Design a protein around this ligand. Structure first.
Ligand SMILES: Nc1ncnc2c1ncn2[C@@H]1O[C@H](COP(=O)(O)OP(=O)(O)O)[C@@H](O)[C@H]1O
Ligand SMILES: Nc1ncnc2c1ncn2[C@@H]1O[C@H](COP(=O)(O)OP(=O)(O)O)[C@@H](O)[C@H]1O
Ligand SMILES: Nc1ncnc2c1ncn2[C@@H]1O[C@H](COP(=O)(O)OP(=O)(O)O)[C@@H](O)[C@H]1O
Ligand SMILES: Nc1ncnc2c1ncn2[C@@H]1O[C@H](COP(=O)(O)OP(=O)(O)O)[C@@H](O)[C@H]1O
Lengths: 250, 70, 250, 70, 250, 250
């Protein structure tokens, strides 16, 4: 089982959108996948997956033995092969213990999940550290913006102070080729020259993403959305298939 | 053209971030403590008063610091 | 002195942009203002104010007596009457003490600051709780988006749980009237019917905001930017002047 | 061959003497006061803890100091 | 502690060479020794001891409280038990106060120095008077030459206008037995019949002395140098051991 | 009248030998010359000129009006056209006044002296400063030795800190070509690369110099002495005649 953390440092770059679209895309490809919300007291994954109302037991409930993995897992109704483990809603920093999280991950491998997508919260503190700790891969989610690139670099410093190493990938999100050519936005290449890691995807700015979270329907399910198609390309690249980068030229 | 300004501002910090892990935990603490202190006796803000660490092919270091006075 | 916290819960809604533009606008109006970065290990205020390279001592340095308020305060060079106290860069959650923050705030009142703008981090954890704790007013920063409205409501619950209570204001940010009328985006009124608080400003989606953070120049300084003008209106409303809401119709 | 050692030792000083007239009566007083002070917190003897002043074609100066640590 | 002044009146007779070789020789014999440069504005001791580049603080810095004795003392790296206090470089006659010099000497006795060697400058003026003032012993350094013998006599007149008296010794330097027998140079006996004081050493003209100052290595350290051996004999005589005078016959 | 100071900083390099030999050489060439001893309390010029016993009145006696220039000047008996003004023997540093020395120099110009040779003492203090103050030219006397080259550089700094500046010349003295080629002694070229001034003479190490001061007969008078011949070359160069440098190769 491949444990993939979706991280960033900077808040509001597209971690949740990406964790959702990618977990769905992998499920569509017939790979049994679970996406876990690692947030502390803020439930945003269930809102984007559209299952905010089916949340009975959460990640912390399973760790403290108040519920089984079967009781807390929410099987997606729209896509076959997809499951969601939602976040706790306590203002509590601890809760998510290292031993606890490890026990949950082993149970999930035992349930034959191929992909365990960890939707990390913002920051460098507790929840974020816990989501990357057991990762095999990290998807560093970034915008062509100064705060986001600075905070992604801080996150790479934390992922690297671990010296099989965490395989790192850059997911450049909310890209706008037109803005890049008018000289108003950092280009894909500018971002790679700074955060020197392998590009795994480029998600264009798309008006389909607001419409997708409005409905609680991950953007990959909208077959006409450019952001959806770029997420399907990302999923291909995660499965080992080379794909040319679309939506980088106008 | 603000993409170019963004790129330069970014490199100078992530070079800064790349650097902090090479230094010890005290050497940069002391420099900030005392070199900036020569403010009372000199008085300039950086505005670059540069700091660059180097090394030799013999497990030796070279902390050089430029003081560009206007 | 009016202590104003800029908060949100959700990451990447415009807290930093707003804290910067508002502190600047107040300074422009001749009011001696300081804007403080309450973040834990992520320095984003200095980046948006354009003084990332003049940062010698920070907020935690002053609390631990390694520096005076005079040594850590950065006087803005572009705008008269404006000062910045930057964030610490340690992963230490403890660092910011209740007693420590209170001591700093009293020193600032003693230095004759009229406005103390507290740029809060995301979340409901440590840094965010510390920024609102001593506030007289709170600017709840929100996008017309599902995750942001949910997380702003959580923050209102914390603000609400001796004296005149925290005066709350809604700063609706990244608004797009065209999107609202095509039925793709929650309207200003939809957001008010949910988070039932007084509207203090509406910041339109503006291509000037990316150009402003690229330069490290708060968007209110761009006299042609619609986001700049809407922030100048907000500043008027904070000073007690009624102003009609611009950029709400297309 | 000690004439060669004598010549090198000499140039380092007469450069030192040629130098003292190039700068202010305080700038070298302060450096000696505080940079050597970081002895309590670091501890190394010169070991020419090198020092070199430079200037630009615009009435600007550049006091750089190398710190070759062993 | 024995305070020994090395004096002469005449310039360039070997005071510095002798102060250095003797201080080193005493240190070699396990006696903790300090050699002090009493010169005014000319630094020649540090050049002969080979520590011209380790000079941070000097004698006048210690007197004016700009530095501690520990900060100005240079511990010799080549010989154990040896220390150097270097000369000031101001054109200032005063500086070296009687009260100041006395304070330094008491601190040195307190640091357990057995021997305090005072390397006096030329002349009969300020620096020279200050170096002999507190002496317990004086080493009158002389060449078999007319100017040197005349100026040494003037110095004896000054040492004697003090009526435990200063113990006086003659250090006949740059002697050449071959020149004496061809009748070209005053003999050792001619010099004693004029300056009627106890002979403590005879240093032969030696090509090793130029090579020693070239390297900044006192000539006693060159175990093959005749001047070195004659300085080691002198050190024995200062420690109370009789030694036959070598290098007086060809 | 050309006022020439013979200076050095370092003691015992050959100032007196050079002042004497040069003043004599100039007198021999029919130029009416006076050589003045500027020393404070040490009379060494009269000893080398061989007139130590004809000294009635000295330089300070003339300044304080206790004697006329005619009463203090000693006409050399051995060489026509040569006169000596001897040094005072008081320890009084004040004695030599700027106004006093200037008055004497004007009287000497009025007596039709072509050359006024000022034999300066060692150091950078009073007597040395007074001897160079009114000079038109300076003869920096140096040995191929580390202390001497360091102290000559200090003297150049003083000479350099209205009219045509002091014309500076290097008189390299006690040179030994054999020692230079065996690598034991700084060469003539090494000394010029350090003290960057015009070479005016090179005086070889000569056993004739000790024999000359023994008799009180300047070494230029010994027609077989190499040092004498090199001083006669120097005198030619001072009179404007180019002469090849002898005794630089072995
Ligand atoms: N490709 C995109 N185009 C347009 N808006 C986007 C895109 N990706 C994300 N967004 C918007 O950016 C905001 C942040 O998305 P989100 O996934 O909630 O961020 P995060 O998980 O990092 O906090 C949301 O308001 C979302 O609508
Ligand atoms: N009015 C606006 N129009 C367009 N983009 C905006 C606007 N306000 C903010 N942004 C963008 O949204 C992102 C988040 O802004 P920021 O102030 O850093 O968020 P926060 O401080 O709340 O975490 C940035 O990329 C910023 O450029
Ligand atoms: N024994 C000796 N043989 C040869 N040269 C000597 C000897 N002693 C001293 N010298 C030389 O005589 C000069 C004067 O020596 P120095 O110690 O500097 O004199 P001072 O301290 O009295 O001014 C130097 O150039 C040195 O090389
Ligand atoms: N060319 C030379 N060869 C040999 N000995 C010399 C030579 N020049 C000077 N000396 C000797 O060097 C010493 C210093 O000479 P002196 O002229 O008295 O020095 P100063 O006047 O500079 O103090 C004397 O002992 C002198 O005999």
């Amino acid at each position: 089982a491949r444990i993939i953390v979706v991280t960033s440092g900077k808040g509001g770059v597209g971690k949740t959108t990406s964790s959702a679209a990618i977990a769905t895309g992998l499920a569509q490809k017939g790979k049994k996948t679970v996406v876990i919300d690692f947030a502390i007291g803020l439930r945003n994954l269930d809102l984007i997956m559209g299952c905010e109302r089916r949340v009975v037991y959460d990640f912390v409930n399973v760790i403290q033995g108040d519920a089984t993995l079967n009781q807390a897992l929410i099987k997606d109704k729209r896509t076959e092969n997809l499951y969601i483990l939602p976040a706790s809603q306590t203002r509590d920093k601890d809760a998510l213990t290292r031993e606890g999280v490890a026990k949950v991950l082993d149970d999930l491998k035992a349930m034959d999940f191929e992909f365990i997508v960890c939707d990390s919260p913002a920051g460098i503190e507790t929840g974020a550290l816990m989501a990357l700790y057991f990762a095999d891969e990290a998807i560093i989610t970034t915008n062509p913006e100064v705060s986001s690139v600075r905070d992604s670099d801080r996150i790479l410093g934390i992922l690297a102070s671990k010296s099989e190493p965490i395989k790192e990938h850059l997911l450049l999100t909310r890209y706008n080729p037109g803005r890049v050519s008018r000289g108003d936005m950092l280009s894909m290449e500018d971002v790679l020259e700074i955060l020197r890691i392998k590009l795994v995807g480029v998600i264009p700015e798309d008006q389909s993403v607001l419409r997708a979270s409005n409905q609680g329907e991950p953007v990959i399910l909208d077959i006409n959305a450019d952001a959806g198609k770029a997420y399907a390309d990302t999923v291909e690249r995660l499965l080992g298939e080379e794909r040319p980068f679309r939506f980088i030229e106008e | 053209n603000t993409a170019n300004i963004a790129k330069e501002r970014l490199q100078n910090i992530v070079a800064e971030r790349r650097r902090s892990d090479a230094e010890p935990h005290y050497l940069p603490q002391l420099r900030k403590d005392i070199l900036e202190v020569i403010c009372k006796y000199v008085q300039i803000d950086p505005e670059m008063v540069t700091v660059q660490l180097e090394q030799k092919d013999g497990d030796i270091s070279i902390l050089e610091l430029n003081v560009t006075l206007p």
